[PDB]
Each structure stands twice: as structure tokens, then as C-alpha cells.
Structure 1
Amino acid sequence: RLSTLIEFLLHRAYSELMVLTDLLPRKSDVERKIEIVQFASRTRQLFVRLLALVKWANNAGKVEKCAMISSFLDQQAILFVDTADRLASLARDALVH
């Protein structure tokens, strides 16, 4: 990751703000209102990101438990697949003799 995307969005917003303030000496009241609306939209996006982070942290321990269970299940499935491959090789691949 979240830090990567957070820093990328922050750098993009900073570059946009710098490019918009470079020509600040020619901004009117309508331009100020448009900038305020853009800042409000950015704040709404940040609030939505914070709400998403909160919803993800509210189910983070369960997510970690499910990931550990999935890893254990993948290990068990790999062991079962190896056993099945050995049985198949012993029963239908080495019966030439």
C-alpha cells in the first residue's frame, strides 16, 4: 504494498498542484472555486481509501488465518498429488517388466 501506491498518488498530486500553482498569477475566482472542488474531490478519495483500509483491517486477522489455512491446504494437496503420481507410476507406468 500500500505504501507504494500511496507514495505514487502523493507524488502525482504534488506534481499536479505544482503545475497548477505555477500559473497562479492568472487565476480568477472561478479558478479558485475549481481548485477548491478538486481539493474536495481529492479529500473524498482519501476518505474512501481510509474507509477501504479500515474495512480491510477489520478482517485482517481472519485474512491471515485463512491464508495460513490455504498454505497448509496447498501443502497437503501437493503431498497428495505426489503420492498419487507415485502410485500411478508404480501401477501403470512401470508395469512393462
Structure 2
Amino acid sequence: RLSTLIEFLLHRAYSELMVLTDLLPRKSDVERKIEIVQFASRTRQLFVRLLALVKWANNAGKVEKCAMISSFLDQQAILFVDTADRLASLARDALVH
């Protein structure tokens, strides 16, 4: 998923750079530098967010392990609730008949 996100971000940055290069001569140069520095700020934001994502990518295993631990403990928790329900249902419904 990080590969697809990186490829999509690269394609979007390339399309935006091509659109800025096409619209650079249309816009006035003083405002064109403002647009270029704004787009460069955008590309720096994309690059640092991809940097944060790939800084997370090494830590995916701990998140997956904690998720598996949570699922196991919830599974057991559900069973305890189920046993109580089984006890309540058998003690209150089957017995009366």
C-alpha cells in the first residue's frame, strides 16, 4: 500500500509540476514565483509525509502484533460474556418449562 501511495504521490506531483510549467508563462512572473514557492512547499510537504510514512513502515510489525494481541484478548473476553449469557439463558428459560 505504501508503494501504491508513493507512486500515486509521484504521479500527482509530476502532473502538478507539468501544470505549473504549462501555466508559468500564462501567469505573471512575480506571481509565478509565488506559485512556484507554494508548489515547492507542497512538494516538501508530500516528501516529508512520505518520509513519515516510511519511518512508520519499519514499525508496522509491532502494530500488527499488538492488534493480534488485542484480537486474542477480545476473543477470550467475548467467550466469558457468552458463557454468562449461556448460564443466564439456561437458568431463566429452559428451567421454567
Query: Is TM-score (shorter-chain normalized) higher than 0.5?
Result: yes
Q: Which segment is superposed worse, 38-47 or 1-10? A: 1-10
The 1:66/1:79 distance shift into structure 2, 3 A limit, reads same
After TM superposition, the score normalised by the length of structure 2 is 0.68
CA distance in structure 1 between the partners assigned to 2:23 and 2:41 by the alignment: 21
The 1:29/1:38 distance shift into structure 2, 3 A limit, reads same
Any unmatched runs of 5+ in structure 2?
none
After TM superposition, the score normalised by the length of structure 1 is 0.68
Larger RCO (alpha carbons 8 Å, 6+ apart): 2
Q: Where does residue 26 of structure 2 map in the other structure?
A: 26
Aligned length: 97
The 1:88/1:78 distance shift into structure 2, 3 A limit, reads same
Any unmatched runs of 5+ in structure 1?
none
Query: Aligned-pair RMSD on alpha carbons?
Result: 2.8
Percent identity, aligned pairs only, is 100
Q: Which segment is superposed worse, 58-67 or 11-20? A: 11-20
